[PDB]
Amino acid sequence: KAKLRASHTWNPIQQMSINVDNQFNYVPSNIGGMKIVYEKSQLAPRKLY
Amino acid sequence: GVGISTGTFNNQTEFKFLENGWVEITANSSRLVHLNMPESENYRRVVVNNMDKTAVNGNMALDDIHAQIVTPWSLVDANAWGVWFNPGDWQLIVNTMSELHLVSFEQEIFNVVLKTVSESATQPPTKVYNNDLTASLMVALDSNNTMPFTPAAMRSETLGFYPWKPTIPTPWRYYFQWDRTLIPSHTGTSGTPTNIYHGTDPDDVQFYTIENSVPVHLLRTGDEFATGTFFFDCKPCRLTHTWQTNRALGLPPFLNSLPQSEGATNFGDIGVQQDKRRGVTQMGNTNYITEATIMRPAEVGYSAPYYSFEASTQGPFKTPIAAGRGGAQTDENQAADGNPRYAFGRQHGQKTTTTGETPERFTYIAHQDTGRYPEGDWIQNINFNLPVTNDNVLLPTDPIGGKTGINYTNIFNTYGPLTALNNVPPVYPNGQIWDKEFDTDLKPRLHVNAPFVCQNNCPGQLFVKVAPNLTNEYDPDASANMSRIVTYSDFWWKGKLVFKAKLRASHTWNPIQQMSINVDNQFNYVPSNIGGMKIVYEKSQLAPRKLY
Amino acid sequence: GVGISTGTFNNQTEFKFLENGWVEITANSSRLVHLNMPESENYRRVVVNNMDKTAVNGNMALDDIHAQIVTPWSLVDANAWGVWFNPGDWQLIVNTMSELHLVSFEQEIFNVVLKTVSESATQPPTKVYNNDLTASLMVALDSNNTMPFTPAAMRSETLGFYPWKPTIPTPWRYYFQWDRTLIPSHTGTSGTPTNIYHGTDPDDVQFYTIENSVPVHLLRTGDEFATGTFFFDCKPCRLTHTWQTNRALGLPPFLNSLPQSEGATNFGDIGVQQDKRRGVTQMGNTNYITEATIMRPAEVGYSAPYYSFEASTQGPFKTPIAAGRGGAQTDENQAADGNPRYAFGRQHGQKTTTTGETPERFTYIAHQDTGRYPEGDWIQNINFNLPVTNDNVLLPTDPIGGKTGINYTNIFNTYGPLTALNNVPPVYPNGQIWDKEFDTDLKPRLHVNAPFVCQNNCPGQLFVKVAPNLTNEYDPDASANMSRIVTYSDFWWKGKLVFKAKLRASHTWNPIQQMSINVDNQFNYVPSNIGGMKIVYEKSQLAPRKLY
């Protein structure tokens, strides 16, 4: 069960995104080699107090 | 009343999730508008003739001759992305929604104030500001859309983009018919090409006044004004880009040989002679079936003449294109046609604290691959004998008209009954949101300036003006100029735009492209020690969508 | 309206006795708040770097480097005891109640006034004050507690403590993420320890604006504003102190010999050999049962590292402790860690008529005996051979790390599953009343700055600001600074705090410690011939309570 996030700052947040450097970690090789690079999970900030 | 506020400030954008992944975005925007009395209290019919500049052969594109009506009214325009969303909100929309629907619009004027500048021409000449309690602000909402439509965003003249910075409306003016003739030439064109401003076709004449057409409201401090809610009529806006070219449609060729080893050079291979393959083509006289040759269902994108100026009744004008290029080949350096360029000020993105009057600018390179590399184009004689022979090919390299800097691609047009294209993507924050359709029998399939065109009905424009604050002396029959008390007004403007969006769903194994802050852009989203602010533009159809 | 007051002054605290010894205290506080336009109308992102000061080896604790956002808004904070009760009321609570419950809070803004200073730069340059009748005060109540929580009491920046003295709000500012590295050193540390301000982690960035987050209210003279009633969620506060140490828990030893005569030296005597007594201990290898040795059920208080600075992502910080010491051994001279120190001004206790800018201060020595005399501590080898031998003991006297001014007590920690402690007592009048819990997975068992922490819900902060009073000249695209009419506002603030208390009952033969005026403190509760006022701090858990 998840809850959707809401923006609260003027500035954007840190999001996970594919890019020219990681791109090939998400698709097979000509050999069919596969890999599953690890990722981070609490990317956005929250105020503590 | 006098000591009573008539409104509330609200610049909060609410996101309210419904059922089945539909959100209802309601953008609240509030500003303090500052307004001065008019230069004059008259309608002026003015012509702009820069003949001198076009007088130089080879400078036709520098043409600015036009006629316009100058009015004593100001336009309150809030149709630009930056007025309603901040970098924060844009990230939310753009990274998580897949389509946008513009639903409605409302705006209201409150907490009106009128003051009069009194100068006590002293040693150090002084001036006292006093409240004119019985003075009036004049408001006119052209809801029947009588007046000619003038989107202030094509001039970077919208309300400003920051809720804690007061703003101002623009002086309203509109085009008045004129007739002008300009013959193109070039550097070293013997003579002086005709360059004539003929004047006005009487049957094309339309002088409009606000006073005669819209009901005018006088608001005093105690008053307030509110437009009601207007609903738009518009097809939804997609928040995704397409990437498939004619070259990537349908079933790829079956590879009879597959790489055995990993390696950037370990390719697979179709195993069949290009002249011995099965499949369909539209080259009735050839047995070659290649990826450039095999049949595709229609064509994605089209070729159009580039840096093409056309001419009608009023001077030359640039031929518009639905999409430019950029990617593998175009960056700022691989500069082309079709990509829009935005110039603007401190109120709309140029760094606040920056000194200097050069506009801030940017060329927008979308993400949908629907354009062209004219350099890769070629025409070739129907016999199709292959290593084609210099005179059975027309290359972007051979000159047309004997001009060495012109090739057939500049005059080329491949638009036709199989053309498939997409409407224009949103440009945050400088782009216009909605546009009025042309009241033309046949209409344009798109508008290159707004993703939303309202057909049957658009919100009308809002005009404002300080009413005349006369002095004791006033003689209407004097050929002079009416003397007025120096008055100005400050009022609060509150607008409300509602959207409907749908949430995106992952469909691939691999992640998507998302907007994110990072060590290189970070400082573009926070103030300076000086309080300098800036609003860097962003892209909007970041995620891919399959075309077919 | 213009000639109509919109509110009432009320600074009366009512005590309403219910049934079964429950009182319902309702504290009314009213002040006249004075407010000026902002330095700027912008949000500013500023860094504070006193590198120069830390540049001296041995001065790390003098670190002040931080980044913060400076906002054009002011904060109205009334969370300090002194805002709601006077010395008189405090005596009543503290001498006769045994527990306090914070129930609710309400505040409202009325009788708003805005004036504009006009200077008639004359010989003796003059200035006229005039009322700006249509001007507005801007009020924002962050009830969803969006903005970061900034209790003005940790800076002695609350409303003032006297109902007949006008006050002012504080400029609101909040911390902005930064990265800094500082290596400790000492007098004569060869070299220059790294002392670096690295900058901002982009993923830790959060720029907040009031305008984009809270609904803003414009109030003109005729207007008024009122927060509604907020109910807090908080465990009760005890008004009694405990005095029992591990040493005083349970059944004392039965004395086989009792004094026969009165006399400060006529002691009674256990009659049994310490190694021949019955009872329980946790010293499995010993037959000695003494009062230092016999088993107690848990431990009252704990030992924590002292004058311990810890370091994380943003610089060093002092390790906090739940209770200090004082009593038999500590007074001002027997100075220790854990006791809070308060510094403040004329608005919060420093004598009014006193000239000079040194803050007024005080170190609070509570009354609950739950702390430690580190000097009485000792570690001793498990063999327990008794007149312990210098190398089977670690005394607060032996040096650690070869430093002669450091002993194991400074790095010591005896907190564990048997620790029993009490929350912090109230500090009248400079102490904060309530505090916001940390939005952390695991929370702190207490807060050393307020006896009341509201968990699930706290009242939101109140922000105020003079709206921009522009002049005739205003150009939003100028890189200059907006020119405004010198405006200021005075408004009345009325707040209402309700408590629930329970009345105390005598349970001992002997009287209790009560707060009382006397020939030595008397003059601290009345004005000077000059009208000088002062507000000496007081203690709150005067009566004892049994722990077990």
From Swiss-Prot, chains B, C:
Intracellular or extracellular location(s): Virion; Host nucleus
Example of a GO MF term: metal ion binding
UniProt GO BP: adhesion receptor-mediated virion attachment to host cell; clathrin-dependent endocytosis of virus by host cell; entry receptor-mediated virion attachment to host cell; microtubule-dependent intracellular transport of viral material towards nucleus; symbiont entry into host cell via permeabilization of host membrane; viral penetration into host nucleus
Residues holding Mg(2+): N144
Keywords (A to Z) from UniProt: Capsid protein, Clathrin-mediated endocytosis of virus by host, Cytoplasmic inwards viral transport, Disulfide bond, Host nucleus, Host-virus interaction, Magnesium, Metal-binding, Microtubular inwards viral transport, T=1 icosahedral capsid protein, Viral attachment to host adhesion receptor, Viral attachment to host cell, Viral attachment to host entry receptor, Viral penetration into host cytoplasm, Viral penetration into host nucleus, Viral penetration via permeabilization of host membrane, Virion, Virus endocytosis by host, Virus entry into host cell
Predominant subcellular localization, coarse grouping: virion
One term under GO cellular component: T=1 icosahedral viral capsid
UniProt keyword rRNA-binding, yes or no: no
N-terminal signal peptide: none
Disulphide bond pairs: C454-C458
Subunit annotation: Interacts with host TFRC.
Family affiliation: Belongs to the parvoviridae capsid protein family.
Remarks, miscellaneous: The capsids of autonomous parvoviruses expose a proportion of VP2 N-terminus and part of that sequence can be cleaved of to form VP3.
Role played: Capsid protein self-assembles to form an icosahedral capsid with a T=1 symmetry, about 22 nm in diameter, and consisting of 60 copies of two size variants of the capsid proteins, VP1 and VP2, which differ by the presence of an N-terminal extension in the minor protein VP1. The capsid encapsulates the genomic ssDNA. Capsid proteins are responsible for the attachment to host cell receptor TFRC. This attachment induces virion internalization predominantly through clathrin-endocytosis.
Domain notes: The N-terminus of VP1 is sequestered within the mature capsid. It contains a phospholipase A2-like region and nuclear localization signals that might be exposed by capsid modifications during virus entry.
Protein name: Capsid protein VP1
Species assigned in the record: Canine parvovirus type 2 (isolate Dog/United States/CPV-b/1978) (CPV-2)
